[PDB]
Design brief:
This protein is mainly alpha-helical and 75 residues long. The protein has a single domain (1-75), classed as EF-hand (Recoverin, domain 1, Orthogonal Bundle), CATH 1.10.238. The protein has helices spanning 3-14, 25-35, 46-53, 63-73, and strands at 23-24, 60-61. Helix 1 (3-14) crosses helix 2 (25-35) and helix 3 (46-53) packs antiparallel against helix 4 (63-73). The longest helix is centred in the first third of the chain and has 12 residues, at 3-14. The protein starts with a helix and ends with a helix. The structure holds manganese (II) ion. Manganese (II) ion is lined by residues 54, 56, 58, 60-61. Residues 9-44, 41-75 form the EF-hand domain. It holds the Pfam family S_100. Ca(2+) 1 binds at residues 22, 27. This is Protein S100-G. Keywords: Acetylation, Calcium, Metal-binding, Phosphoprotein, Repeat, Vitamin D.
Length: 75
């Protein structure tokens, strides 16, 4: 998906609660489940990518971190 598309999806779930410019791990799980169900298949690397990308260790990732996460978890 294009970044413009990806931004709209990210915002929709981040808006659920907390900071509208961050996504917690649970918000990311609901987002993948409904938007990219195929990315949640077989052994997962979600927690490893999540831990590496959440640099400030606050349990949340920014839009650019999310983009990287979708990209990497896909290959
Ligand atoms: Mn963070």
């Amino acid at each position: 998906k294009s970044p413009e598309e990806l931004k709209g999806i990210f915002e929709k779930y981040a808006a659920k609660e907390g900071d509208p410019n961050q996504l917690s791990k649970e918000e990311l799980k609901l987002l993948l489940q409904t938007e990219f169900p195929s990315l949640l298949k077989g052994p997962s690397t979600l927690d490893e990518l999540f831990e590496e990308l959440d640099k400030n260790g606050d349990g949340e990732v920014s839009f650019e971190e999310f983009q990287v996460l979708v990209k990497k978890i896909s290959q």
